[PDB]
Amino acid sequence: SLSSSLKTCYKYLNQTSRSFAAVIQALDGEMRNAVCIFYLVLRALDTLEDDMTISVEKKVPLLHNFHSFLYQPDWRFMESKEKDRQVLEDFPTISLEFRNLAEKYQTVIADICRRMGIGMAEFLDKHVTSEQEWDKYCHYVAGLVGIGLSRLFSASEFEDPLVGEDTERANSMGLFLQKTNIIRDYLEDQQGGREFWPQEVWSRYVKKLGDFAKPENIDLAVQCLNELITNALHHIPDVITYLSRLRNQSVFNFCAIPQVMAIATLAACYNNQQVFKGAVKIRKGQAVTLMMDATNMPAVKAIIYQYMEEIYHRIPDSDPSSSKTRQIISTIRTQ
């Protein structure tokens, strides 16, 4: 007998999370509404961050104060031009359901929104330069989501306190997904005028990140691609450790599915010129199979090892990162 507003929230979840909404909707007990609301609040925050029609002057206070809008019943934002803007225009429905969650969940969600808003605002006046800065950006937009979810799982008591306590492993869960998405979305990001590849890496190949879209630079582009994929692989040990600690089946499926999708995506992208022409994606047929299979730790490890073997046997001897790629894969296989 869900409230009017909560029913609306689940409708927006299906609109913004698509097939993944069902995995959230399968979560046990109190975790279901807490994670639904967290995802919607995060989508609203991201829609503000993404909107290039909002000046930096106007955007900074929105990002900084976003966590407080959760407690302002009539707060909404009507000036977005973005696709997911219904979560901003009807933010009062989302914030009402947020205020109906238990305090222990409110505290986590608001804390993460505060910290993410601060970090997102920090990156409005700079690009990602070093690999250390890439990790910091990924922390603010994704690692903190992994930390927040983990704290919700522990707060609900379906998982042990360790899951929320080990913020290093939780952060790695988010970094692996976010780095994978950034690598895959090179061209789409190009086309929306966004740049997320770290400048200290790409600038060793070309003078402007957009130069990787030019056909004459494809060999350099693929080398840089492989170097970034090699970086992302370093998170796999932590992903395996994190997933190995989960007790609740519904939580396991929620956490494992995105990670298996991400490793499949990195394997698809590895040494693949098509990243620079638009169309590297794990399509729905393969996604359905992975969803079905990724329900226990031995099966997840088997999937990870399979995709790592795919990459390993595709590594070109001449690739500048070949030694490093072989080394991290060796580590993953040995854990």
Please give the positions annotated as active site.
Answer: 137, 184, 194, 254
Please indicate if the annotation marks 114 as binding a ligand: no
CA-to-CA dists, residue 102 to 9, 91, 109, 110, 114, angstroms: 17, 19, 11, 12, 18
50 annotated to bind ligand: yes
**234 contact partners, CB below 8 Å, separation of at least 6:** 328
Total Cβ atoms within 10 A of residue 313: 7
Closest CA to 174 of 242, 87, 266: 242
Whole-angstrom distance, CA of residue 51 vs CA of residue 64: 16
Q: Directed axis angle between helix 236-244 and helix 297-312, to 10°?
A: 170
Neighbours of 283 (CB within 10 A): 8
Distance of CA 82 to the CA centre of its chain: 19
Contact 143, 174 (CB under 8 A): yes
Residue with tokens 């429905």: 93
Are 128 and 196 in contact, with CB atoms under 8 Å apart? yes
Q: Is 326 flagged in the annotation as binding?
A: no
**314 assigned to a ligand binding site:** no
Q: Is 18 annotated as a binding residue?
A: yes
The response to whether 281 counts as a known ligand-binding position is yes
- Residues across the chain: 335
N-to-C CA span, the chain: 47
Q: What is the three-class DSSP state of 292?
A: helix
The CA distances from residue 99 to 12, 62, 107, 112, in Å, are: 17, 20, 11, 16
Could you say which DSSP state residue 278 is in? Answer: S
Annotated binding site: 18, 43, 46, 49-50, 184, 281, 283
Annotated binding site for NADP(+): 18, 43, 184, 281, 283
Annotated binding site for Mg(2+): 46, 49-50
